[model samples]
Target: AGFIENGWEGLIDGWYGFRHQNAQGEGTAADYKSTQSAIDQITGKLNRLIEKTNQQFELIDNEFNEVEKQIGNVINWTRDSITEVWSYNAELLVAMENQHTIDLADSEMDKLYERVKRQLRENAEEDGTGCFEIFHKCDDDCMASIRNNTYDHSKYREEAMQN
Candidate 1:
C-alpha cells in the first residue's frame, strides 16, 4: 500500500566525499554525505534493503487486514446464531406458557366437576334436589329406558367413571 523514496542518496554521497568532520546540516532533505560511490554503494545497499523490506511490510499489513476482516465476518455469524437460538427459545417459552394456561383451566374444571357431584349427591341422600330428580323420573311410564340412562349416584360414590 506504500512506496519509499531515496532522494537523500545525492546529498548522502556528497557529504561522505567532502568530509565535514561532524558538522550540522540545515535540512533533513536540503542539507546532508559521501564516500561518494563508497557511500553510494553502501547507502544504495542500505536503501535497497530498506525499500525491499518496506514492500514486504506493506504486503504483511494487507494480509493482516484480510485476516482481520475474515475474523470480523465470523464474529457477526456467531452473533446471528446466538440471536436465532434466543428467539427460538423465547418463542417456545411463550407457547409453553399458553399451553399451561389452557391446562390450568381444564384442571380447575375437573376439580369443580368432582366437588359439584360430591356435594349434590351427598345432600340428595336426605334432601331432594333438582340435579338428582332424574332418579325419580325412571319409575314413570313414559320413560322406558330412563332407568338405563340414569343410575344411582350413591353407588358410584367411591370413584368417578370418567373425567
Candidate 2:
C-alpha cells in the first residue's frame, strides 16, 4: 500500500490509448451545414488528441520512476544482507573443523615419535651390552649398532603400550 496507488493508476492508464469524449451513448451528425466546417471540427479534434497522447505517455514515464526506485532498493538490500550472513555461517564450520584436524594429527604423531625413539634405544643397549660382555670387549661397531638401532612399533605394540 505504500506505492501501490501509482502501480494501479499506471496500469489502468496504459491499458487504454484513447479518451472518451461524449457519454456512453452515440450522437448523430446528420444536420450539418457545410463539409468545410465538418472537416475543420475533425481536424481540430485530431490535433488535440495527438498532443494529449504525447503528454500522457511522458506523464506515465515520469510517474513510475519513483516506484521502480523504491522496489529496487528493497530487493537489492535484502539479498546482499542475507548473502553475507550465509558466508559468515559457512566459514564458522569450516574454521572449526580445519583447526581440529591439524591439532589431532599433531598430538597423535608426537606420541608416536616418542615411542619409536625410546624402544629403539632400550632394545639396542640391552642386546649389545650382553653380547659385548660375552666377547670380552665392546668395540666401536658394537657401540655404533647400539646407538643407531631402528625400531618397529607394530611388532612391539604390547611392550610399547604397557604403561
Candidate 3:
C-alpha cells in the first residue's frame, strides 16, 4: 500500500526523454528496450551523417573560400590597373582643362558603381550562386530534420524488434 502510494504519486521517468524508464513497475522494459535500441541506431546514424556532412561541407567551403580569395586578389589587381589608367588620364585632363570636373565625376561615379556591384556580388556569394548551394542545403535539411523532431523512432523500433 505504501509502495503503491509512493509510485502513484510520482510520474514515470520515461515521460521525459531521459532515464528510459524508472525502477518503478509503472513502465514496461520491453517497450523501453526496444525503443532505446531503435533510438540508438537511428540517432547514431543520423548524428554520424550530420557530422560527416559538416566535415565535408567545411572542407568544400574552405576550398570555395580560397577560390573566392583568389578571385578577390584578381579583382584587386584589375581595380588597381583600372585606377592607374583612369587616374593617369584624369590627372592629364585636369592639367589640360584646368577643370577637375571630369576627374571628380569619374572618381565619384566609379566609387558608387563599384559599391553597388560589390553589394550585388556579395549577395550572390551568400546565396550560393558564387558558391555551392548543395552543401548548405544538405546541412540545412539535416539540421531541420533533427531540430523539428521529425525522426520517428517508432518505425525504427519496429524494425529493430523484428530483427
Instruction: Highest TM-score: give the candidate number.
Output: 1
Model 2, span 4-87: residue lDDT tens: 122223333221111111223322222122223434554664565453233432232244455576766776687789999979
The Cα error of candidate 2 at residue 152, in Å, is 11
**Cα lDDT computed for each candidate against the true fold:** 0.39, 0.39, 0.38
Q: How well does model 3 score by local distance difference test?
A: 0.38
How accurate locally is residue 145 in candidate 3, as Cα lDDT from 0 to 100?
36
TM-score of candidate 2 against the unseen true structure: 0.29
Off by over 4 Å in 1: 1-67, 122-163
C-alpha RMSD in Å of predicted model 1 compared with the true structure: 46.5
Q: How high a TM-score does candidate 1 get?
A: 0.35
Model 3, stretches more than 4 Å misplaced?
1-67, 99-163
The alpha-carbon lDDT assigned to residue 17 of candidate 3 equals: 21
Better of 1 and 2 by TM-score: 1
- Candidate 1 lDDT over 1-163, as tens digits, reads 0111222355542321111111233222211211232334545645654532334322322434555777667866877899999899869976875575545544443443344345445323322221232222222321222212344555544443231
Q: Which candidate do you rate higher for lDDT, 1 or 3?
A: 1
Comparing 1 and 3 on TM-score, the stronger one: 1
> What is the lDDT for 40 in model 3?
60
lDDT string, candidate 3, 1-163, tens digits: 1111222224343211211211232222122433354456546745654532334322222434455777668767877999999899868854754344334433443443344234332112223122211111123333233224353334334433432
In order of listing, the candidates' clash counts read: 10, 0, 0
